[PDB]
PDB file of all heavy atoms in Angstrom:
ATOM      1  N   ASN A   1     176.512 -88.473  75.315  1.00 33.45           N
ATOM      2  CA  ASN A   1     176.071 -87.488  74.368  1.00 33.45           C
ATOM      3  C   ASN A   1     175.926 -87.985  72.901  1.00 33.45           C
ATOM      4  O   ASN A   1     176.141 -89.204  72.631  1.00 33.45           O
ATOM      5  CB  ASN A   1     177.054 -86.328  74.375  1.00 33.45           C
ATOM      6  CG  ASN A   1     178.491 -86.731  73.997  1.00 33.45           C
ATOM      7  OD1 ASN A   1     178.656 -87.692  73.248  1.00 33.45           O
ATOM      8  ND2 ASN A   1     179.469 -86.011  74.523  1.00 33.45           N
ATOM      9  N   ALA A   2     175.571 -87.085  72.025  1.00 31.26           N
ATOM     10  CA  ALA A   2     175.248 -87.390  70.623  1.00 31.26           C
ATOM     11  C   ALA A   2     176.391 -88.014  69.832  1.00 31.26           C
ATOM     12  O   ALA A   2     176.181 -88.981  69.113  1.00 31.26           O
ATOM     13  CB  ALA A   2     174.764 -86.154  69.924  1.00 31.26           C
ATOM     14  N   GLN A   3     177.604 -87.477  70.007  1.00 33.36           N
ATOM     15  CA  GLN A   3     178.772 -88.007  69.386  1.00 33.36           C
ATOM     16  C   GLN A   3     178.990 -89.478  69.783  1.00 33.36           C
ATOM     17  O   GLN A   3     179.416 -90.336  68.981  1.00 33.36           O
ATOM     18  CB  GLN A   3     180.000 -87.170  69.773  1.00 33.36           C
ATOM     19  CG  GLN A   3     181.325 -87.786  69.494  1.00 33.36           C
ATOM     20  CD  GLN A   3     182.431 -86.834  69.913  1.00 33.36           C
ATOM     21  OE1 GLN A   3     182.292 -86.109  70.918  1.00 33.36           O
ATOM     22  NE2 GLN A   3     183.523 -86.810  69.152  1.00 33.36           N
ATOM     23  N   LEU A   4     178.679 -89.785  71.047  1.00 32.71           N
ATOM     24  CA  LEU A   4     178.888 -91.108  71.562  1.00 32.71           C
ATOM     25  C   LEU A   4     177.864 -92.058  70.999  1.00 32.71           C
ATOM     26  O   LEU A   4     178.171 -93.209  70.686  1.00 32.71           O
ATOM     27  CB  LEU A   4     178.893 -91.107  73.092  1.00 32.71           C
ATOM     28  CG  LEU A   4     180.227 -91.486  73.716  1.00 32.71           C
ATOM     29  CD1 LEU A   4     181.357 -90.614  73.216  1.00 32.71           C
ATOM     30  CD2 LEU A   4     180.145 -91.267  75.218  1.00 32.71           C
ATOM     31  N   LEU A   5     176.651 -91.563  70.848  1.00 31.83           N
ATOM     32  CA  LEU A   5     175.591 -92.373  70.148  1.00 31.83           C
ATOM     33  C   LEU A   5     175.942 -92.631  68.695  1.00 31.83           C
ATOM     34  O   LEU A   5     175.725 -93.775  68.216  1.00 31.83           O
ATOM     35  CB  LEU A   5     174.227 -91.670  70.247  1.00 31.83           C
ATOM     36  CG  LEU A   5     173.558 -91.720  71.625  1.00 31.83           C
ATOM     37  CD1 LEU A   5     172.350 -90.801  71.633  1.00 31.83           C
ATOM     38  CD2 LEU A   5     173.175 -93.152  72.024  1.00 31.83           C
ATOM     39  N   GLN A   6     176.414 -91.626  67.969  1.00 32.59           N
ATOM     40  CA  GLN A   6     176.806 -91.857  66.610  1.00 32.59           C
ATOM     41  C   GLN A   6     177.937 -92.873  66.573  1.00 32.59           C
ATOM     42  O   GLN A   6     177.989 -93.730  65.639  1.00 32.59           O
ATOM     43  CB  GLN A   6     177.266 -90.579  65.894  1.00 32.59           C
ATOM     44  CG  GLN A   6     177.592 -90.813  64.458  1.00 32.59           C
ATOM     45  CD  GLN A   6     176.368 -91.086  63.584  1.00 32.59           C
ATOM     46  OE1 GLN A   6     175.529 -90.229  63.361  1.00 32.59           O
ATOM     47  NE2 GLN A   6     176.268 -92.317  63.050  1.00 32.59           N
ATOM     48  N   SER A   7     178.882 -92.805  67.488  1.00 34.88           N
ATOM     49  CA  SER A   7     179.946 -93.790  67.562  1.00 34.88           C
ATOM     50  C   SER A   7     179.480 -95.220  67.866  1.00 34.88           C
ATOM     51  O   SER A   7     179.923 -96.174  67.294  1.00 34.88           O
ATOM     52  CB  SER A   7     181.009 -93.397  68.554  1.00 34.88           C
ATOM     53  OG  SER A   7     181.937 -92.521  67.927  1.00 34.88           O
ATOM     54  N   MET A   8     178.520 -95.306  68.775  1.00 33.68           N
ATOM     55  CA  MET A   8     177.825 -96.616  68.961  1.00 33.68           C
ATOM     56  C   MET A   8     177.242 -97.144  67.700  1.00 33.68           C
ATOM     57  O   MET A   8     177.393 -98.357  67.378  1.00 33.68           O
ATOM     58  CB  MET A   8     176.747 -96.538  70.058  1.00 33.68           C
ATOM     59  CG  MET A   8     177.262 -96.355  71.463  1.00 33.68           C
ATOM     60  SD  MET A   8     175.900 -96.095  72.623  1.00 33.68           S
ATOM     61  CE  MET A   8     176.372 -94.482  73.244  1.00 33.68           C
ATOM     62  N   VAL A   9     176.588 -96.321  66.881  1.00 33.51           N
ATOM     63  CA  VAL A   9     176.027 -96.797  65.621  1.00 33.51           C
ATOM     64  C   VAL A   9     177.132 -97.197  64.616  1.00 33.51           C
ATOM     65  O   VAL A   9     177.068 -98.209  63.968  1.00 33.51           O
ATOM     66  CB  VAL A   9     175.049 -95.715  64.932  1.00 33.51           C
ATOM     67  CG1 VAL A   9     174.732 -96.142  63.507  1.00 33.51           C
ATOM     68  CG2 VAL A   9     173.816 -95.578  65.716  1.00 33.51           C
ATOM     69  N   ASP A  10     178.219 -96.378  64.535  1.00 32.28           N
ATOM     70  CA  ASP A  10     179.280 -96.770  63.635  1.00 32.28           C
ATOM     71  C   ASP A  10     180.089 -97.972  64.071  1.00 32.28           C
ATOM     72  O   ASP A  10     180.805 -98.574  63.298  1.00 32.28           O
ATOM     73  CB  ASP A  10     180.194 -95.534  63.374  1.00 32.28           C
ATOM     74  CG  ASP A  10     179.462 -94.310  62.895  1.00 32.28           C
ATOM     75  OD1 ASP A  10     178.457 -94.420  62.122  1.00 32.28           O
ATOM     76  OD2 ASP A  10     179.912 -93.179  63.241  1.00 32.28           O
ATOM     77  N   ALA A  11     180.023 -98.325  65.334  1.00 34.73           N
ATOM     78  CA  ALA A  11     180.800 -99.444  65.864  1.00 34.73           C
ATOM     79  C   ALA A  11     180.122-100.803  65.587  1.00 34.73           C
ATOM     80  O   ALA A  11     180.719-101.852  65.667  1.00 34.73           O
ATOM     81  CB  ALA A  11     181.077 -99.287  67.367  1.00 34.73           C
ATOM     82  N   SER A  12     178.844-100.753  65.233  1.00 35.06           N
ATOM     83  CA  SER A  12     177.978-101.929  65.108  1.00 35.06           C
ATOM     84  C   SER A  12     178.472-103.005  64.175  1.00 35.06           C
ATOM     85  O   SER A  12     178.899-102.765  63.074  1.00 35.06           O
ATOM     86  CB  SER A  12     176.582-101.516  64.654  1.00 35.06           C
ATOM     87  OG  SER A  12     175.718-102.599  64.483  1.00 35.06           O
ATOM     88  N   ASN A  13     178.373-104.284  64.620  1.00 36.58           N
ATOM     89  CA  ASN A  13     178.696-105.398  63.763  1.00 36.58           C
ATOM     90  C   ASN A  13     177.710-105.549  62.651  1.00 36.58           C
ATOM     91  O   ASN A  13     178.079-105.761  61.499  1.00 36.58           O
ATOM     92  CB  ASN A  13     178.751-106.700  64.552  1.00 36.58           C
ATOM     93  CG  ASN A  13     179.726-106.636  65.699  1.00 36.58           C
ATOM     94  OD1 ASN A  13     180.879-106.225  65.514  1.00 36.58           O
ATOM     95  ND2 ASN A  13     179.272-107.031  66.891  1.00 36.58           N
ATOM     96  N   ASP A  14     176.462-105.406  63.048  1.00 36.16           N
ATOM     97  CA  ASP A  14     175.329-105.486  62.107  1.00 36.16           C
ATOM     98  C   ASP A  14     175.129-104.231  61.302  1.00 36.16           C
ATOM     99  O   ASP A  14     175.404-103.150  61.777  1.00 36.16           O
ATOM    100  CB  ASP A  14     174.056-105.806  62.892  1.00 36.16           C
ATOM    101  CG  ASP A  14     174.096-107.117  63.600  1.00 36.16           C
ATOM    102  OD1 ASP A  14     174.927-107.992  63.152  1.00 36.16           O
ATOM    103  OD2 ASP A  14     173.435-107.240  64.633  1.00 36.16           O
ATOM    104  N   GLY A  15     174.652-104.373  60.072  1.00 39.94           N
ATOM    105  CA  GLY A  15     174.241-103.244  59.283  1.00 39.94           C
ATOM    106  C   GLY A  15     173.052-102.640  59.971  1.00 39.94           C
ATOM    107  O   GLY A  15     172.233-103.390  60.559  1.00 39.94           O
ATOM    108  N   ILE A  16     172.944-101.322  59.932  1.00 41.27           N
ATOM    109  CA  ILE A  16     171.771-100.618  60.486  1.00 41.27           C
ATOM    110  C   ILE A  16     171.260 -99.556  59.530  1.00 41.27           C
ATOM    111  O   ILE A  16     172.000 -98.753  59.047  1.00 41.27           O
ATOM    112  CB  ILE A  16     172.090 -99.950  61.813  1.00 41.27           C
ATOM    113  CG1 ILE A  16     172.454-101.009  62.868  1.00 41.27           C
ATOM    114  CG2 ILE A  16     170.946 -99.182  62.302  1.00 41.27           C
ATOM    115  CD1 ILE A  16     172.781-100.416  64.239  1.00 41.27           C
ATOM    116  N   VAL A  17     169.953 -99.614  59.285  1.00 40.41           N
ATOM    117  CA  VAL A  17     169.301 -98.664  58.376  1.00 40.41           C
ATOM    118  C   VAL A  17     168.051 -98.043  58.983  1.00 40.41           C
ATOM    119  O   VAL A  17     167.366 -98.694  59.773  1.00 40.41           O
ATOM    120  CB  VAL A  17     168.914 -99.335  57.037  1.00 40.41           C
ATOM    121  CG1 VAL A  17     170.139 -99.903  56.328  1.00 40.41           C
ATOM    122  CG2 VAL A  17     167.826-100.399  57.224  1.00 40.41           C
ATOM    123  N   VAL A  18     167.743 -96.853  58.569  1.00 39.47           N
ATOM    124  CA  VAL A  18     166.504 -96.189  58.900  1.00 39.47           C
ATOM    125  C   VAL A  18     165.740 -95.772  57.682  1.00 39.47           C
ATOM    126  O   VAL A  18     166.272 -95.229  56.696  1.00 39.47           O
ATOM    127  CB  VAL A  18     166.708 -94.897  59.708  1.00 39.47           C
ATOM    128  CG1 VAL A  18     165.364 -94.244  60.025  1.00 39.47           C
ATOM    129  CG2 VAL A  18     167.442 -95.179  61.003  1.00 39.47           C
ATOM    130  N   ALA A  19     164.441 -96.059  57.710  1.00 38.16           N
ATOM    131  CA  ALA A  19     163.561 -95.811  56.602  1.00 38.16           C
ATOM    132  C   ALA A  19     162.298 -95.004  57.009  1.00 38.16           C
ATOM    133  O   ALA A  19     161.848 -95.144  58.126  1.00 38.16           O
ATOM    134  CB  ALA A  19     163.205 -97.148  55.974  1.00 38.16           C
ATOM    135  N   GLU A  20     161.790 -94.214  56.106  1.00 41.98           N
ATOM    136  CA  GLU A  20     160.465 -93.587  56.346  1.00 41.98           C
ATOM    137  C   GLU A  20     159.504 -94.018  55.260  1.00 41.98           C
ATOM    138  O   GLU A  20     159.899 -94.209  54.112  1.00 41.98           O
ATOM    139  CB  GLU A  20     160.578 -92.069  56.367  1.00 41.98           C
ATOM    140  CG  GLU A  20     160.918 -91.412  55.031  1.00 41.98           C
ATOM    141  CD  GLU A  20     161.150 -89.946  55.172  1.00 41.98           C
ATOM    142  OE1 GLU A  20     160.840 -89.442  56.247  1.00 41.98           O
ATOM    143  OE2 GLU A  20     161.637 -89.274  54.192  1.00 41.98           O
ATOM    144  N   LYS A  21     158.235 -94.154  55.609  1.00 43.38           N
ATOM    145  CA  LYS A  21     157.204 -94.596  54.689  1.00 43.38           C
ATOM    146  C   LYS A  21     156.758 -93.529  53.734  1.00 43.38           C
ATOM    147  O   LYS A  21     156.404 -92.414  54.099  1.00 43.38           O
ATOM    148  CB  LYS A  21     156.004 -95.130  55.471  1.00 43.38           C
ATOM    149  N   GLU A  22     156.846 -93.880  52.454  1.00 45.39           N
ATOM    150  CA  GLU A  22     156.220 -93.166  51.319  1.00 45.39           C
ATOM    151  C   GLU A  22     155.148 -94.086  50.766  1.00 45.39           C
ATOM    152  O   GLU A  22     155.491 -95.163  50.322  1.00 45.39           O
ATOM    153  CB  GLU A  22     157.281 -92.910  50.228  1.00 45.39           C
ATOM    154  CG  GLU A  22     156.822 -92.806  48.729  1.00 45.39           C
ATOM    155  CD  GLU A  22     156.504 -94.144  48.049  1.00 45.39           C
ATOM    156  OE1 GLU A  22     157.105 -95.189  48.433  1.00 45.39           O
ATOM    157  OE2 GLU A  22     155.683 -94.163  47.105  1.00 45.39           O
ATOM    158  N   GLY A  23     153.864 -93.780  50.915  1.00 43.36           N
ATOM    159  CA  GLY A  23     152.892 -94.589  50.173  1.00 43.36           C
ATOM    160  C   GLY A  23     153.059 -96.098  50.380  1.00 43.36           C
ATOM    161  O   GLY A  23     153.047 -96.579  51.502  1.00 43.36           O
ATOM    162  N   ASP A  24     153.271 -96.809  49.285  1.00 47.30           N
ATOM    163  CA  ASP A  24     153.461 -98.242  49.322  1.00 47.30           C
ATOM    164  C   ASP A  24     154.916 -98.703  49.436  1.00 47.30           C
ATOM    165  O   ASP A  24     155.153 -99.913  49.489  1.00 47.30           O
ATOM    166  CB  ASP A  24     152.807 -98.905  48.105  1.00 47.30           C
ATOM    167  N   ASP A  25     155.901 -97.806  49.459  1.00 47.31           N
ATOM    168  CA  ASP A  25     157.303 -98.203  49.640  1.00 47.31           C
ATOM    169  C   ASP A  25     158.049 -97.402  50.742  1.00 47.31           C
ATOM    170  O   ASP A  25     157.783 -96.194  50.940  1.00 47.31           O
ATOM    171  CB  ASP A  25     158.083 -98.116  48.323  1.00 47.31           C
ATOM    172  CG  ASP A  25     157.627 -99.180  47.306  1.00 47.31           C
ATOM    173  OD1 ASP A  25     156.446 -99.570  47.273  1.00 47.31           O
ATOM    174  OD2 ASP A  25     158.431 -99.622  46.500  1.00 47.31           O
ATOM    175  N   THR A  26     159.027 -98.023  51.330  1.00 45.95           N
ATOM    176  CA  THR A  26     159.784 -97.461  52.458  1.00 45.95           C
ATOM    177  C   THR A  26     161.226 -97.108  52.052  1.00 45.95           C
ATOM    178  O   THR A  26     162.022 -97.954  51.697  1.00 45.95           O
ATOM    179  CB  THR A  26     159.857 -98.493  53.588  1.00 45.95           C
ATOM    180  OG1 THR A  26     158.558 -99.033  53.824  1.00 45.95           O
ATOM    181  CG2 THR A  26     160.255 -97.871  54.875  1.00 45.95           C
ATOM    182  N   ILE A  27     161.540 -95.823  52.095  1.00 45.11           N
ATOM    183  CA  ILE A  27     162.794 -95.359  51.547  1.00 45.11           C
ATOM    184  C   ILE A  27     163.867 -95.129  52.676  1.00 45.11           C
ATOM    185  O   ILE A  27     163.517 -94.746  53.787  1.00 45.11           O
ATOM    186  CB  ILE A  27     162.644 -94.014  50.761  1.00 45.11           C
ATOM    187  CG1 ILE A  27     162.234 -92.906  51.682  1.00 45.11           C
ATOM    188  CG2 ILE A  27     161.660 -94.197  49.603  1.00 45.11           C
ATOM    189  CD1 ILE A  27     162.371 -91.527  51.057  1.00 45.11           C
ATOM    190  N   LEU A  28     165.125 -95.386  52.307  1.00 46.88           N
ATOM    191  CA  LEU A  28     166.169 -95.275  53.299  1.00 46.88           C
ATOM    192  C   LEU A  28     166.548 -93.820  53.505  1.00 46.88           C
ATOM    193  O   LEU A  28     166.948 -93.132  52.575  1.00 46.88           O
ATOM    194  CB  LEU A  28     167.419 -96.051  52.856  1.00 46.88           C
ATOM    195  CG  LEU A  28     167.351 -97.569  52.853  1.00 46.88           C
ATOM    196  CD1 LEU A  28     168.629 -98.128  52.209  1.00 46.88           C
ATOM    197  CD2 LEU A  28     167.219 -98.067  54.286  1.00 46.88           C
ATOM    198  N   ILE A  29     166.381 -93.326  54.715  1.00 50.69           N
ATOM    199  CA  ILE A  29     166.923 -92.015  55.007  1.00 50.69           C
ATOM    200  C   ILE A  29     168.276 -92.178  55.706  1.00 50.69           C
ATOM    201  O   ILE A  29     169.018 -91.212  55.837  1.00 50.69           O
ATOM    202  CB  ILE A  29     165.995 -91.119  55.835  1.00 50.69           C
ATOM    203  CG1 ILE A  29     165.870 -91.736  57.262  1.00 50.69           C
ATOM    204  CG2 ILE A  29     164.682 -90.985  55.214  1.00 50.69           C
ATOM    205  CD1 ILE A  29     165.032 -90.877  58.148  1.00 50.69           C
ATOM    206  N   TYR A  30     168.614 -93.386  56.124  1.00 53.09           N
ATOM    207  CA  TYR A  30     169.954 -93.589  56.730  1.00 53.09           C
ATOM    208  C   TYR A  30     170.507 -94.991  56.630  1.00 53.09           C
ATOM    209  O   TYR A  30     169.765 -95.923  56.748  1.00 53.09           O
ATOM    210  CB  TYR A  30     169.948 -93.119  58.206  1.00 53.09           C
ATOM    211  CG  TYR A  30     171.253 -93.320  58.907  1.00 53.09           C
ATOM    212  CD1 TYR A  30     172.222 -92.316  58.930  1.00 53.09           C
ATOM    213  CD2 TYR A  30     171.544 -94.510  59.597  1.00 53.09           C
ATOM    214  CE1 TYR A  30     173.415 -92.446  59.559  1.00 53.09           C
ATOM    215  CE2 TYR A  30     172.764 -94.662  60.213  1.00 53.09           C
ATOM    216  CZ  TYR A  30     173.709 -93.668  60.208  1.00 53.09           C
ATOM    217  OH  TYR A  30     174.910 -93.828  60.858  1.00 53.09           O
ATOM    218  N   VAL A  31     171.801 -95.106  56.424  1.00 53.10           N
ATOM    219  CA  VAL A  31     172.509 -96.399  56.527  1.00 53.10           C
ATOM    220  C   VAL A  31     173.862 -96.172  57.244  1.00 53.10           C
ATOM    221  O   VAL A  31     174.502 -95.152  57.107  1.00 53.10           O
ATOM    222  CB  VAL A  31     172.799 -97.039  55.146  1.00 53.10           C
ATOM    223  CG1 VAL A  31     171.498 -97.257  54.411  1.00 53.10           C
ATOM    224  CG2 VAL A  31     173.702 -96.175  54.319  1.00 53.10           C
ATOM    225  N   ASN A  32     174.293 -97.177  58.019  1.00 49.13           N
ATOM    226  CA  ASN A  32     175.626 -97.071  58.653  1.00 49.13           C
ATOM    227  C   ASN A  32     176.633 -97.748  57.778  1.00 49.13           C
ATOM    228  O   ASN A  32     176.294 -98.318  56.737  1.00 49.13           O
ATOM    229  CB  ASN A  32     175.567 -97.708  60.065  1.00 49.13           C
ATOM    230  CG  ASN A  32     175.450 -99.231  60.096  1.00 49.13           C
ATOM    231  OD1 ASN A  32     175.474 -99.891  59.061  1.00 49.13           O
ATOM    232  ND2 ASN A  32     175.328 -99.776  61.256  1.00 49.13           N
ATOM    233  N   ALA A  33     177.872 -97.675  58.202  1.00 47.63           N
ATOM    234  CA  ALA A  33     178.990 -98.175  57.360  1.00 47.63           C
ATOM    235  C   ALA A  33     179.002 -99.684  57.229  1.00 47.63           C
ATOM    236  O   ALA A  33     179.269-100.219  56.143  1.00 47.63           O
ATOM    237  CB  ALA A  33     180.309 -97.705  57.905  1.00 47.63           C
ATOM    238  N   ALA A  34     178.609-100.382  58.321  1.00 49.06           N
ATOM    239  CA  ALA A  34     178.513-101.867  58.265  1.00 49.06           C
ATOM    240  C   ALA A  34     177.636-102.288  57.133  1.00 49.06           C
ATOM    241  O   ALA A  34     177.963-103.221  56.406  1.00 49.06           O
ATOM    242  CB  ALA A  34     177.989-102.437  59.582  1.00 49.06           C
ATOM    243  N   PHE A  35     176.545-101.564  56.960  1.00 47.07           N
ATOM    244  CA  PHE A  35     175.574-101.879  55.889  1.00 47.07           C
ATOM    245  C   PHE A  35     176.206-101.684  54.519  1.00 47.07           C
ATOM    246  O   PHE A  35     176.047-102.527  53.645  1.00 47.07           O
ATOM    247  CB  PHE A  35     174.323-101.013  56.032  1.00 47.07           C
ATOM    248  CG  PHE A  35     173.251-101.337  55.066  1.00 47.07           C
ATOM    249  CD1 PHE A  35     172.330-102.367  55.314  1.00 47.07           C
ATOM    250  CD2 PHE A  35     173.135-100.675  53.831  1.00 47.07           C
ATOM    251  CE1 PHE A  35     171.377-102.700  54.426  1.00 47.07           C
ATOM    252  CE2 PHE A  35     172.177-101.008  52.938  1.00 47.07           C
ATOM    253  CZ  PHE A  35     171.307-102.014  53.238  1.00 47.07           C
ATOM    254  N   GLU A  36     176.939-100.578  54.336  1.00 50.94           N
ATOM    255  CA  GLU A  36     177.623-100.282  53.102  1.00 50.94           C
ATOM    256  C   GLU A  36     178.656-101.302  52.638  1.00 50.94           C
ATOM    257  O   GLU A  36     178.830-101.615  51.439  1.00 50.94           O
ATOM    258  CB  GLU A  36     178.352 -98.924  53.162  1.00 50.94           C
ATOM    259  CG  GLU A  36     177.483 -97.761  53.629  1.00 50.94           C
ATOM    260  CD  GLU A  36     178.255 -96.495  53.642  1.00 50.94           C
ATOM    261  OE1 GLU A  36     178.834 -96.130  52.585  1.00 50.94           O
ATOM    262  OE2 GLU A  36     178.262 -95.824  54.693  1.00 50.94           O
ATOM    263  N   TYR A  37     179.423-101.789  53.607  1.00 51.34           N
ATOM    264  CA  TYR A  37     180.483-102.740  53.239  1.00 51.34           C
ATOM    265  C   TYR A  37     179.918-104.150  53.117  1.00 51.34           C
ATOM    266  O   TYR A  37     180.438-104.951  52.339  1.00 51.34           O
ATOM    267  CB  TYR A  37     181.657-102.549  54.182  1.00 51.34           C
ATOM    268  CG  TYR A  37     182.218-101.173  53.950  1.00 51.34           C
ATOM    269  CD1 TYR A  37     182.063-100.142  54.893  1.00 51.34           C
ATOM    270  CD2 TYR A  37     182.812-100.847  52.732  1.00 51.34           C
ATOM    271  CE1 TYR A  37     182.539 -98.879  54.649  1.00 51.34           C
ATOM    272  CE2 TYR A  37     183.259 -99.578  52.470  1.00 51.34           C
ATOM    273  CZ  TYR A  37     183.153 -98.602  53.440  1.00 51.34           C
ATOM    274  OH  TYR A  37     183.584 -97.342  53.224  1.00 51.34           O
ATOM    275  N   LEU A  38     178.897-104.438  53.932  1.00 49.66           N
ATOM    276  CA  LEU A  38     178.162-105.678  53.837  1.00 49.66           C
ATOM    277  C   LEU A  38     177.533-105.836  52.417  1.00 49.66           C
ATOM    278  O   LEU A  38     177.652-106.896  51.772  1.00 49.66           O
ATOM    279  CB  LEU A  38     177.094-105.768  54.889  1.00 49.66           C
ATOM    280  CG  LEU A  38     175.954-106.819  54.799  1.00 49.66           C
ATOM    281  CD1 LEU A  38     176.513-108.231  54.964  1.00 49.66           C
ATOM    282  CD2 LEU A  38     174.844-106.540  55.780  1.00 49.66           C
ATOM    283  N   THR A  39     176.845-104.813  51.941  1.00 50.04           N
ATOM    284  CA  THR A  39     176.202-104.865  50.659  1.00 50.04           C
ATOM    285  C   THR A  39     177.130-104.526  49.507  1.00 50.04           C
ATOM    286  O   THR A  39     176.853-104.841  48.349  1.00 50.04           O
ATOM    287  CB  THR A  39     175.005-103.908  50.598  1.00 50.04           C
ATOM    288  OG1 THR A  39     175.504-102.564  50.661  1.00 50.04           O
ATOM    289  CG2 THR A  39     174.036-104.116  51.783  1.00 50.04           C
ATOM    290  N   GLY A  40     178.272-103.880  49.801  1.00 49.49           N
ATOM    291  CA  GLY A  40     179.196-103.467  48.750  1.00 49.49           C
ATOM    292  C   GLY A  40     178.705-102.283  48.012  1.00 49.49           C
ATOM    293  O   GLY A  40     179.287-101.786  47.032  1.00 49.49           O
ATOM    294  N   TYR A  41     177.539-101.761  48.460  1.00 47.53           N
ATOM    295  CA  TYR A  41     176.961-100.539  47.922  1.00 47.53           C
ATOM    296  C   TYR A  41     177.300 -99.358  48.843  1.00 47.53           C
ATOM    297  O   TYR A  41     177.098 -99.480  50.025  1.00 47.53           O
ATOM    298  CB  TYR A  41     175.455-100.664  47.743  1.00 47.53           C
ATOM    299  CG  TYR A  41     174.975-101.756  46.783  1.00 47.53           C
ATOM    300  CD1 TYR A  41     174.462-102.940  47.298  1.00 47.53           C
ATOM    301  CD2 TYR A  41     174.954-101.590  45.410  1.00 47.53           C
ATOM    302  CE1 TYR A  41     173.955-103.957  46.439  1.00 47.53           C
ATOM    303  CE2 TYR A  41     174.520-102.561  44.556  1.00 47.53           C
ATOM    304  CZ  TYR A  41     174.007-103.763  45.093  1.00 47.53           C
ATOM    305  OH  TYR A  41     173.539-104.741  44.242  1.00 47.53           O
ATOM    306  N   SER A  42     177.790 -98.267  48.305  1.00 48.55           N
ATOM    307  CA  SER A  42     178.111 -97.082  49.104  1.00 48.55           C
ATOM    308  C   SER A  42     176.837 -96.388  49.497  1.00 48.55           C
ATOM    309  O   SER A  42     175.765 -96.566  48.895  1.00 48.55           O
ATOM    310  CB  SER A  42     179.033 -96.081  48.382  1.00 48.55           C
ATOM    311  OG  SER A  42     178.318 -95.162  47.607  1.00 48.55           O
ATOM    312  N   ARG A  43     176.902 -95.537  50.552  1.00 48.83           N
ATOM    313  CA  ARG A  43     175.774 -94.801  51.037  1.00 48.83           C
ATOM    314  C   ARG A  43     175.065 -93.902  50.002  1.00 48.83           C
ATOM    315  O   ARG A  43     173.860 -93.837  49.959  1.00 48.83           O
ATOM    316  CB  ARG A  43     176.190 -93.896  52.236  1.00 48.83           C
ATOM    317  CG  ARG A  43     175.178 -92.787  52.579  1.00 48.83           C
ATOM    318  CD  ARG A  43     175.553 -92.055  53.866  1.00 48.83           C
ATOM    319  NE  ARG A  43     175.960 -93.007  54.875  1.00 48.83           N
ATOM    320  CZ  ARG A  43     176.974 -92.847  55.722  1.00 48.83           C
ATOM    321  NH1 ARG A  43     177.749 -91.787  55.656  1.00 48.83           N
ATOM    322  NH2 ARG A  43     177.191 -93.783  56.670  1.00 48.83           N
TER     323      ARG A  43
END
């Protein structure tokens, strides 16, 4: 189920992000925790 999918994403070693296209730039609609601690930038 959905909770288990979210847990799979939060368990990831790699940073994971989702973006949607605006015109000529792609904006982040999602980042996981790995990405936040990797970059040192919070969500």
